[PDB]
Amino acid sequence: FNSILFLLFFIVNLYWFNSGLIFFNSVYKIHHDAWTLIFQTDSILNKLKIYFFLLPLYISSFIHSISTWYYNYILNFLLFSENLNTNTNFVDYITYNTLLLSKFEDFNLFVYIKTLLITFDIRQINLDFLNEYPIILLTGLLFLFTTIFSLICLSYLGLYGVFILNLASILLFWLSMLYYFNLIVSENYYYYISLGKWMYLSNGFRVSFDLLIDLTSISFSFLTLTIGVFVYIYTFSYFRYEPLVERLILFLNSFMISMILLVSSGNFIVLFLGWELIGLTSFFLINFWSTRVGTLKAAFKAFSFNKLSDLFLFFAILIIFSTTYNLDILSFNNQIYLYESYNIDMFYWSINLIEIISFFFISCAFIKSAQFGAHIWLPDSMEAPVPASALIHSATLVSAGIYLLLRLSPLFELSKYAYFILPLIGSVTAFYGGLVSAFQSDTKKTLAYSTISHCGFLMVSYSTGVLEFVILYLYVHGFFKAATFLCVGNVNRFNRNIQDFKRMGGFYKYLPFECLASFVCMINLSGLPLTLGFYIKHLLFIGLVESYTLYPLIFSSLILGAIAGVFYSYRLFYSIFFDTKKGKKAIYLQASRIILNSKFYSNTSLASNLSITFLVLISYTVILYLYCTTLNNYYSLSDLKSIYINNAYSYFYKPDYNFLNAVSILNWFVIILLISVIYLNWRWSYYYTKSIDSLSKFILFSFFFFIFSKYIL
Amino acid sequence: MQNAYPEITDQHREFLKKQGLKVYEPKPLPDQINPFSKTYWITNAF
Amino acid sequence: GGFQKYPIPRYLHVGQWIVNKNWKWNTFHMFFPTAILCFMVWRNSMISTAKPPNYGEYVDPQSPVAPKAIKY
Amino acid sequence: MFNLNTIYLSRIFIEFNFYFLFFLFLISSIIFYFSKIISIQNLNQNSVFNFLKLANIFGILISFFIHIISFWFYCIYSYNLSLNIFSDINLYNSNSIELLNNSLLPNYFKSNITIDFFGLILLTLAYIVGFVSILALDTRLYWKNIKYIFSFTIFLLIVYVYVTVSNILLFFMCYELLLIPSFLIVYFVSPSRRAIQASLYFVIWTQLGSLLVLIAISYIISITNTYEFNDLKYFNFTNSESTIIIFLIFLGFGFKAPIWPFHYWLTKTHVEAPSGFSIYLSGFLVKTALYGFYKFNTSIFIDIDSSIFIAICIMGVVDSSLKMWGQTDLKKLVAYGTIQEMNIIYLAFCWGDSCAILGGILFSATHAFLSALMFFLVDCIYRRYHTRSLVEVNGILHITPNLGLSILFMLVFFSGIPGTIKFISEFYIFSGLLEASPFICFILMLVANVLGLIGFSKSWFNATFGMPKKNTKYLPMDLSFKESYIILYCFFFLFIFSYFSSIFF
Amino acid sequence: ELFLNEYRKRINNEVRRAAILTPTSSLREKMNHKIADQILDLSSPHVRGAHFQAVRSWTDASK
Amino acid sequence: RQNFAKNITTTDIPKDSHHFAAKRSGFTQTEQAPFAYNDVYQYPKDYKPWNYNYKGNGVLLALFLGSAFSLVAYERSYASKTGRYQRKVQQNYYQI
Numbered sequence A: 001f002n003s004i005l006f007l008l009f010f011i012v013n014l015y016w017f018n019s020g021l022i023f024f025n026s027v028y029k030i031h032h033d034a035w036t037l038i039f040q041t042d043s044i045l046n047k048l049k050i051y052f053f054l055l056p057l058y059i060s061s062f063i064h065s066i067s068t069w070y071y072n073y074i075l076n077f078l079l080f081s082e083n084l085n086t087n088t089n090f091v092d093y094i095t096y097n098t099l100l101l102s103k104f105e106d107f108n109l110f111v112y113i114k115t116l117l118i119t120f121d122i123r124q125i126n127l128d129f130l131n132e133y134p135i136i137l138l139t140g141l142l143f144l145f146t147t148i149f150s151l152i153c154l155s156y157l158g159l160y161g162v163f164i165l166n167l168a169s170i171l172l173f174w175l176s177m178l179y180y181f182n183l184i185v186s187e188n189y190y191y192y193i194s195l196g197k198w199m200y201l202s203n204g205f206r207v208s209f210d211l212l213i214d215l216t217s218i219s220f221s222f223l224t225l226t227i228g229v230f231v232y233i234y235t236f237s238y239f240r241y242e243p244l245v246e247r248l249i250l251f252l253n254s255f256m257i258s259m260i261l262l263v264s265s266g267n268f269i270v271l272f273l274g275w276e277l278i279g280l281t282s283f284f285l286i287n288f289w290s291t292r293v294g295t296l297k298a299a300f301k302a303f304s305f306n307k308l309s310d311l312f313l314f315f316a317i318l319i320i321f322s323t324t325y326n327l328d329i330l331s332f333n334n335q336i337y338l339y340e341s342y343n344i345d346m347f348y349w350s351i352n353l354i355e356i357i358s359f360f361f362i363s364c365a366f367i368k369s370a371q372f373g374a375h376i377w378l379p380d381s382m383e384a385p386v387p388a389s390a391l392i393h394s395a396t397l398v399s400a401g402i403y404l405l406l407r408l409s410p411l412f413e414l415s416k417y418a419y420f421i422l423p424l425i426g427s428v429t430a431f432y433g434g435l436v437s438a439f440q441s442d443t444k445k446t447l448a449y450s451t452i453s454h455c456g457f458l459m460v461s462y463s464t465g466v467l468e469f470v471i472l473y474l475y476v477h478g479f480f481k482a483a484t485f486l487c488v489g490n491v492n493r494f495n496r497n498i499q500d501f502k503r504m505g506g507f508y509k510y511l512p513f514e515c516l517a518s519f520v521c522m523i524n525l526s527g528l529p530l531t532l533g534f535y536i537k538h539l540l541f542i543g544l545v546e547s548y549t550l551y552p553l554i555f556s557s558l559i560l561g562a563i564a565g566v567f568y569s570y571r572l573f574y575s576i577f578f579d580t581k582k583g584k585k586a587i588y589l590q591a592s593r594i595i596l597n598s599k600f601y602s603n604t605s606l607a608s609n610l611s612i613t614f615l616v617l618i619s620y621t622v623i624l625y626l627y628c629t630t631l632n633n634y635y636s637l638s639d640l641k642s643i644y645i646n647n648a649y650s651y652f653y654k655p656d657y658n659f660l661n662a663v664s665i666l667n668w669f670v671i672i673l674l675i676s677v678i679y680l681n682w683r684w685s686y687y688y689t690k691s692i693d694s695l696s697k698f699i700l701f702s703f704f705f706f707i708f709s710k711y712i713l
Numbered sequence B: 001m002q003n004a005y006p007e008i009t010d011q012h013r014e015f016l017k018k019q020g021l022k023v024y025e026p027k028p029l030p031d032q033i034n035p036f037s038k039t040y041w042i043t044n045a046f
Numbered sequence C: 001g002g003f004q005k006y007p008i009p010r011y012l013h014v015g016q017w018i019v020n021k022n023w024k025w026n027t028f029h030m031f032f033p034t035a036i037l038c039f040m041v042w043r044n045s046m047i048s049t050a051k052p053p054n055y056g057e058y059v060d061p062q063s064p065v066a067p068k069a070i071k072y
Numbered sequence D: 001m002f003n004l005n006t007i008y009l010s011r012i013f014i015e016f017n018f019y020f021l022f023f024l025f026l027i028s029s030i031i032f033y034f035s036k037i038i039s040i041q042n043l044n045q046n047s048v049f050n051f052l053k054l055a056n057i058f059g060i061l062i063s064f065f066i067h068i069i070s071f072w073f074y075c076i077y078s079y080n081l082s083l084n085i086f087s088d089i090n091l092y093n094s095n096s097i098e099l100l101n102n103s104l105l106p107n108y109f110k111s112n113i114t115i116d117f118f119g120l121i122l123l124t125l126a127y128i129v130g131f132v133s134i135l136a137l138d139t140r141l142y143w144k145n146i147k148y149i150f151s152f153t154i155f156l157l158i159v160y161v162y163v164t165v166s167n168i169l170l171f172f173m174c175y176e177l178l179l180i181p182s183f184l185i186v187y188f189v190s191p192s193r194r195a196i197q198a199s200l201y202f203v204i205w206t207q208l209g210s211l212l213v214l215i216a217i218s219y220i221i222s223i224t225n226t227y228e229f230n231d232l233k234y235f236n237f238t239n240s241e242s243t244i245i246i247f248l249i250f251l252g253f254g255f256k257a258p259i260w261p262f263h264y265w266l267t268k269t270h271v272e273a274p275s276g277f278s279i280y281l282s283g284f285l286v287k288t289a290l291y292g293f294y295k296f297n298t299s300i301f302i303d304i305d306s307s308i309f310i311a312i313c314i315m316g317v318v319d320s321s322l323k324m325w326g327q328t329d330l331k332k333l334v335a336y337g338t339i340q341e342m343n344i345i346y347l348a349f350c351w352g353d354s355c356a357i358l359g360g361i362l363f364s365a366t367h368a369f370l371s372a373l374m375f376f377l378v379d380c381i382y383r384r385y386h387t388r389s390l391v392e393v394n395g396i397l398h399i400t401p402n403l404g405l406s407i408l409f410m411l412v413f414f415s416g417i418p419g420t421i422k423f424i425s426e427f428y429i430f431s432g433l434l435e436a437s438p439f440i441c442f443i444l445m446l447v448a449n450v451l452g453l454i455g456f457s458k459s460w461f462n463a464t465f466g467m468p469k470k471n472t473k474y475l476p477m478d479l480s481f482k483e484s485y486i487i488l489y490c491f492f493f494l495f496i497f498s499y500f501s502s503i504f505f
Numbered sequence E: 001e002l003f004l005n006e007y008r009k010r011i012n013n014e015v016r017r018a019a020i021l022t023p024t025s026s027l028r029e030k031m032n033h034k035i036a037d038q039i040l041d042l043s044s045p046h047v048r049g050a051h052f053q054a055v056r057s058w059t060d061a062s063k
Numbered sequence F: 001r002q003n004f005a006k007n008i009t010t011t012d013i014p015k016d017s018h019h020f021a022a023k024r025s026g027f028t029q030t031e032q033a034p035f036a037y038n039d040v041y042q043y044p045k046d047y048k049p050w051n052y053n054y055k056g057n058g059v060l061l062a063l064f065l066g067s068a069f070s071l072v073a074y075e076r077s078y079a080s081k082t083g084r085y086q087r088k089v090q091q092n093y094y095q096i
């Protein structure tokens, strides 16, 4: 009973068995059918020699025969089926199968072991295999199951356990998404995956659970996931020292996965599922402060609007199913043109089928994008914690309508109602949100109304009909809105949950990183000259159509909304950071104590600063990649699957003098507004006269500098 | 079931082949994905 | 920053300020099995995945893979 | 490959499960009557009440397992019977296979058993809902009402004969037998004092419809002397007779299956009845009426416009949905939800034997399970918090997290999320109604799924959320294992029944 | 009736296959063929997709 | 109310008799009499009230055996449907 002796005997037996296998294989090759003539020779000496020298083969065959006999008995017992092929007795069967050695003819122990070892070898995996089969599904399922199981098992996973588990899952998901983003956007790669036959929806119909990873899906998915990764990293610092941080983290993960499922939906049933899931998870995030009933009122407002949108979407899907006996998104997109000519007989009116379907879709899209009239819930949804607010308002909850329009664009291209309604409502919402945000005094409310304005601009861009411009606008707005939301969240946490900047002043020194990060993020968000966010508005005005009947109102509202960005950006930044100290004495004194002076001193989190920095860097890189893909001379974007060409790119490639000078009007309007917000004095100061003098110096120097640059050189 | 797309000629196919295009052909499931594969069952046992 | 900590009843199974000593092993035994489950789901679903042709490939209209209309 | 063995196994299982239940009930009753001079509980650990509870529970459960097996056998049998009829086209060949009865047990009431998918769905609902309700009524049965432990076994036997009979008179008698046990339960087991009047309202309101159905049955039997339920193919009712029969049948069965304005009794009984018996009532006892209406109206040929009946059903749905908001009582709110769902189900049966019946059956199953879930949640709230009123109950989630989670997931399921038989049934009904009358479909969907849904969600969310600062010395602990697993099983069924074979749906 | 619905489901699946295989360019050109005519010919009057009843005369049922 | 017997014989109740001790000397003329039973429940160490504390393999084995039986039964059913004693595995399988 020695382990060393057992191992040595096992190794010796392995070598003997391998040698016997090789010998039998060679002899079998030589004597395919005549091997028995020598193996089973009647000679006693030869029989004994063969048995002794092939004992490992014989014992292995005996064990295999016993195992096969027992397995066949078990199968017969369980299935009440047949016999062991034949009714051979136990003795006859075992003797025959043990004497038979042909089972080893193609078997080599070393080769088999090597195959088993190399089966798990990871060197083999290649990009080509990944390109053939998408690993995005494997990582998304990982993230989903991690979130679900973490929700269920909270006691097992403490604060740190939940954070680390979900961080690993989300990082893997984001890296895979990043890998496939390059292929889908430019290389014309898209996948249609099916998990199975989900449900039966008619007498003989059964819809499968399918996902569509296309350019339209990936544009939203990658943006949401990239924003969510850094929001997740930031939340652990924002909700620092809170009773319930795991709950908030898991709610954020749930909302992210719900939005990902919605955007990457293969059929209307999955789309509706994702729609309801984002609604429910947004409700939970808004109602996070469950103890308070004041929060429940805002949550219930959002819930009612979401249920109305669900009604509209469900009715539209029912109309589509009744018309075409199909719920597949691709099939519907490629079939809708045939049924365009059809009408539906309703109560007393014959409504055009496309018009009614597009009416319901646009209604639900407006409700979820917080357009004018249906936006009443968005200002009240700010009761959620800042990470949840950023995620919902950047690219997750308020872009659902934009995703719907982009995915079902072939439908709306043949919609008279869409043509009339999208530009008017978009421009009105843009103007309303911009002006209200400019006049707003609270940080979260300002960001919410700015989000409403940018959603209006997105609607107007879709009305223009350049899906590339819409996608660029969506990406820019989402990234920079999220970054600004994180910055204001740090500011609010420092200011002790007081979100109004009337009590904020001189925070530049107390939050140095937030000041500069907010400066960059706001100049990019509010379309300002010489910034990454100027081109989105420039392209929107390039593509704006002029055949509308309400074009005067549409254009005036668009101009006012576009200019409104400057006021809110300036007010937010200046009032928060560089205005006179208006906050309570405690806020400043508690942090100005000399004892706190240390290398570790900070009023924010190092992880939060790093998360914001990485978010800004990645947003810049991705926006540049999209700009190169679309706005470059060589068009390298993937197919959008739309046959409607707007001609808008003509005024981007070869603009005429008329349009070039027309854009200057808005440019100079913005310039005058900047001069007003900078040099305008509302309060007496020691620097009133010197401020007027500086304005005079700037005007005269600008004139002379222009003279020298243009003429004197 | 019957062909839906309009037909093309064998001469046109040969012209495309000379130009360097390839005929799309579905590929068999790899051993890892194939559910009737020794690799698949070794993975299951592991 | 956060709210002041207050006592939570022992009998009540709630998540207020819950931290687990064995969170490392808990995470280890909650991550890898989930990864294996997702791998199984992924390999099951890949059988029913569709991809368009590659860059140098064209679909022959008369090949079986090409779409076929219903024959009455 | 279908063989006669499967046919006979199906028939034998169906026939013998009934006798299994009957013998269990007979033995339990004999023990109960002959063990004590007076049939009341002896307040000690050695009472026969424990044995009777054990026998009832694990007779229902084992019969439910056998019913699963027999239902699967029936599905195979019906599918292969349809294949046998449809497949062969030769004129000389015809499927004429005759089966000989067993010599072990007799045919109850000398009737040959006939089973249908709707009947077996109804029987499965009976089993499951009866199991839940019996599990609920343990705290109510004490020392003088222990005789009502057999009420659910009696219900199961009545429903078994109801769904496994091809005789019109036996069908009607089984339908009418359900009144006595239910009335006795409400009268003697209900804690509240208003249950005394609620029971009388229930009896009178249901008996008016019972009399209407009795008049219809008398019209059918007196005119057609047949009772086989299939000889009606060879007899045609004139227009006047047919319209009278359909009106009587619809009104009579709508008295039981609540329709506007005949739901006053339902609201009263649900509010004032035992929390464990409300589950059984709403889940099952209102669907025997739907099954009977389906059978009668599909057997009779009707040449009348169903617009009036559709209008009645839609008015009931609208009325219940609009009233949902104004209820602070959770039990009454769930009762209004039951009225809404039952009216939708009844509307699903207004087009004769069209494909609407499939959606109606699926919606009946999902409503049974959903109503059981909702009434069980209300029962848990009332039993641990000694009130079922929104003003007195607030912040359930923060003291009983599992109960609050159950409420939230119940609301999500009630909303009709995809992946649930609730969503599937809504899809069936609305897809049909869109083509039948699109504007009516829009109005129905709008009302039910927005206004009624918001009214329903307001009270439940207000109860779940908030801050329970009142009566801190009397706060409960949490759900028990029994309650938690009942809730989990309801969720599991609502989710997984969507994978049931689509052949019958 | 189930068989006609199956025809509609099959043609819808073929349209999805065409959409995935063929790029948006020439997709409508290739669809304006047997496939589009069959899609229109399998509309609601001819196949009962999800309607409660397929309104058929006795002659249509016999056919 | 409950009428079951507390003192079961299937096993001995875990208990600790040292937490509470009964006074037996030094009484006063105003002090109440001590208590006779002072045993408290003692839980097994490493018992976690927040989970099921289930350490058996019976459920897992039952589920795995059910799944394996379902797999083999489906294999046999497919062979019967194809009219063969066993599955005829093809040389190549494609996506579908």
Ligand SMILES: CCCCCCCCCCCCCCCCCC(=O)OC[C@H](COP(=O)([O-])OCC(O)COP(=O)([O-])OC[C@@H](COC(=O)CCCCCCCCCCCCCCCCC)OC(=O)CCCCCCCCCCCCCCCCC)OC(=O)CCCCCCCCCCCCCCCCC
Pocket (backbone or CB within 6 Å): A149, A152, A153, C037, C038, C040, C041, D402, D405, D406, D409, D479, D483, D484, D485, D487, D488, D492, D496, F050, F051, F052, F053, F054, F055, F056, F057, F058, F059, F060, F063
């Ligand atoms: C407190 C509850 C309150 C409830 C009431 C309130 C309800 C409403 C509110 C809800 C929210 C509040 C409650 C939640 C908090 C609870 C807190 C708590 O109690 O903590 C302790 C609780 C228990 O852990 P523990 O106390 O530490 O230890 C328990 C024992 O040690 C474990 O002992 P063991 O290791 O021996 O395990 C025993 C067994 C567990 O035994 C059971 O649970 C018996 C189940 C019998 C069948 C019943 C139907 C099952 C339907 C599917 C769902 C499976 C159950 C998972 C839970 C539901 C989903 C989340 O484990 C298994 O083997 C799992 C496999 C189960 C599969 C069975 C499938 C049957 C057929 C189903 C239909 C056909 C499917 C075809 C699929 C085809 C291929 C895709 O915390 C958890 O661990 C949570 C687990 C959550 C589920 C995930 C893990 C299982 C995954 C199974 C496979 C599915 C995943 C993907 C597979 C992909 C490949 C196929």
Ligand SMILES: CCCCCCCCCCCCCCCCCC(=O)OC[C@H](COP(=O)([O-])OCC(O)COP(=O)([O-])OC[C@@H](COC(=O)CCCCCCCCCCCCCCCCC)OC(=O)CCCCCCCCCCCCCCCCC)OC(=O)CCCCCCCCCCCCCCCCC
Pocket (backbone or CB within 6 Å): A152, D409, D488, D489, D491, D492, D495, F052, F054, F056, F057, F058, F059, F061, F062, F063, F065, F066, F069
């Ligand atoms: C959106 C809504 C979301 C809602 C959900 C949110 C998430 C909720 C999460 C929390 C709740 C769920 C997860 C946790 C559940 C609890 C897990 C747990 O561990 O609890 C511990 C829990 C409490 O532990 P305990 O107090 O110790 O109680 C132990 C049990 O009494 C018994 O334990 P045991 O150790 O005594 O094991 C007993 C076992 C005994 O196990 C065994 O016997 C297996 C080993 C022997 C194999 C046979 C060998 C024969 C030859 C002898 C060989 C030598 C001896 C070998 C054995 C040696 C000993 C090991 O017997 C059985 O299990 C009988 C089953 C038999 C029928 C089914 C399986 C067979 C199918 C057919 C097979 C055909 C082929 C085979 C043929 C065989 C020849 C005829 O125990 C259990 O896990 C029991 C199972 C049921 C637990 C509750 C399950 C609830 C599931 C809820 C699902 C809800 C789904 C909702 C989906 C909604 C979707 C929208």
Ligand SMILES: CCCCCCCCCCCCCCCCCC(=O)OC[C@H](COP(=O)([O-])OCC[N+](C)(C)C)OC(=O)CCCCCCCCCCCCCCCCC
Pocket (backbone or CB within 6 Å): A438, A439, A567, A568, A571, A575, A665, A666, A668, A669, A672, A673, A676, A677, A680, A682
């Ligand atoms: C008539 C010519 C055709 C154009 C028609 C339109 C005329 C111009 C209309 C401009 C409306 C701007 C509204 C901004 C509201 C900002 C509100 C806010 O945030 O608080 C105040 C913030 C300051 O916020 P604050 O926080 O620093 O202090 C606020 C102090 N209290 C509250 C006391 C007021 O910004 C401003 O004060 C600047 C706005 C006032 C000055 C407006 C000058 C307009 C110059 C127009 C130039 C036109 C150029 C020619 C071409 C135009 C057409 C192409």
Ligand SMILES: CCCCCCCCCCCCCCCCCC(=O)OC[C@H](COP(=O)([O-])OCC[N+](C)(C)C)OC(=O)CCCCCCCCCCCCCCCCC
Pocket (backbone or CB within 6 Å): A144, A148, A151, A152, A154, A247, A254, A255, A257, A258, A261, A273, A277, A281, A284, A290, C013, C014, C015, C016, D397, D401, D402, D405, D408
């Ligand atoms: C086979 C494939 C995989 C099978 C897995 C099936 C999973 C089915 C769904 C499981 C849901 C589990 C919920 C657990 C909730 C635990 C309690 C909790 O979180 O705290 C409650 C909190 C606080 O709880 P607490 O701290 O008082 O108590 C925790 C401990 N207990 C409950 C045990 C006492 O209360 C609330 O405010 C309610 C919040 C509910 C939030 C629910 C969000 C769910 C989001 C899921 C997103 C999934 C996306 C899916 C995408 C794909 C869709 C096709």
Ligand SMILES: CCCCCCCCCCCCCCCCCC(=O)OC[C@H](COP(=O)([O-])OCC[N+](C)(C)C)OC(=O)CCCCCCCCCCCCCCCCC
Pocket (backbone or CB within 6 Å): D020, D023, D024, D027, D028, D054, D055, D056, D058, D059
């Ligand atoms: C003409 C023929 C007439 C036949 C009449 C039938 C007479 C029935 C008499 C019932 C007596 C019940 C008490 C027996 C003594 C129990 C002793 C005990 O508890 O020790 C534990 C021992 C053994 O326990 P154990 O620990 O070995 O657990 C294993 C249990 N068995 C053996 C069943 C697998 O006795 C029992 O557990 C028996 C429990 C009996 C009660 C069962 C209740 C469920 C419903 C069935 C009741 C009977 C109705 C008929 C069958 C159903 C319909 C087909």
Ligand SMILES: CCCCCCCCCCCCCCCCCC(=O)OC[C@H](COP(=O)([O-])OCC[N+](C)(C)C)OC(=O)CCCCCCCCCCCCCCCCC
Pocket (backbone or CB within 6 Å): D212, D215, D239, D240, D243, D244, D247, D248, D251
């Ligand atoms: C809703 C009321 C409150 C709730 C209680 C319910 C009570 C009413 C229940 C429904 C009764 C039937 C009403 C619809 C009848 C439709 C057919 C019809 O009459 O049209 C003329 C019919 C149909 O005619 P037709 O024009 O269609 O075709 C035949 C034409 N001729 C004859 C000329 C060839 O004509 C008749 O033959 C007259 C029949 C009159 C029958 C009226 C009495 C019915 C008595 C039995 C039921 C009593 C129930 C009482 C319950 C207790 C009340 C408190």
Ligand SMILES: CCCCCCCCCCCCCCCC(=O)OC[C@H](COP(=O)(O)O)OC(=O)CCCCCCCCCCCCCCC
Pocket (backbone or CB within 6 Å): A119, A120, A121, A122, A123, A124, A125, A126, A129, A135, A138, A172, A175, A176, A179, B030, B031, B032, C032, C035, C036, C039
């Ligand atoms: C560019 C992506 C960047 C992000 C990647 C994140 C990680 C993704 C997960 C790893 C890849 C999995 C898919 C493999 C595809 C494939 O089969 O690729 C094919 C190769 C073999 O090549 P061939 O099939 O072509 O011959 O597969 C293998 O070699 C299988 C070996 C295992 C691979 C990792 C399995 C991960 C699942 C969990 C394992 C848990 C182990 C036990 C823990 C206790």
